[PDB]
Structure 1
Amino acid sequence: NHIIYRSEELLGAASNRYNITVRVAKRAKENRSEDFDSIDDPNMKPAIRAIIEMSDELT
């Protein structure tokens, strides 16, 4: 339930709701390409981790 709070605080503080979506998708693609090894966890998807990291840099 924290990921919808982070998504709401990431959308509310963005200058454009359509540019922040493309930036989250680009960071999620980088997170998926950098974690290409199989040592991972199913509860932390690349898009969820990108939203978490971008909300943590947002503060």
Structure 2
Amino acid sequence: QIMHRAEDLISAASNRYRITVQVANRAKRRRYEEFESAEDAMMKPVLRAIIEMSDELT
């Protein structure tokens, strides 16, 4: 979906905040790393951040 099944990863991964924070940490950089308008990053920096967490979070 766009964002919905993401209610479990954070929910079940030790300290939630903590998660966030890293997740940003992704975020920030994993926009940052590429300022070449890579359309992968055409969408918001987080949401990727998330997801590729997500689907590595198996």
| TM-score bin, normalised by smaller chain | 0.7 to 0.9
- 1:27 matched residue in structure 2: 26
- 2:54 matched residue in structure 1: 55
- 1:4 matched residue in structure 2: 4
Q: Which has the higher helix share?
A: 1
Higher relative contact order (Cα pairs below 8 Å, separated by 6+ residues)? 1
Counting matched residue pairs gives 57
- Runs of 5+ in structure 1 lacking a partner? none
Report deviation, 1:11: 1.4
Name the TM-score, length of structure 1 as normaliser: 0.78
Q: Does 1:18 align with 2:21?
A: no
Identity of aligned residues (%): 60
- Runs of 5+ in structure 2 lacking a partner? none
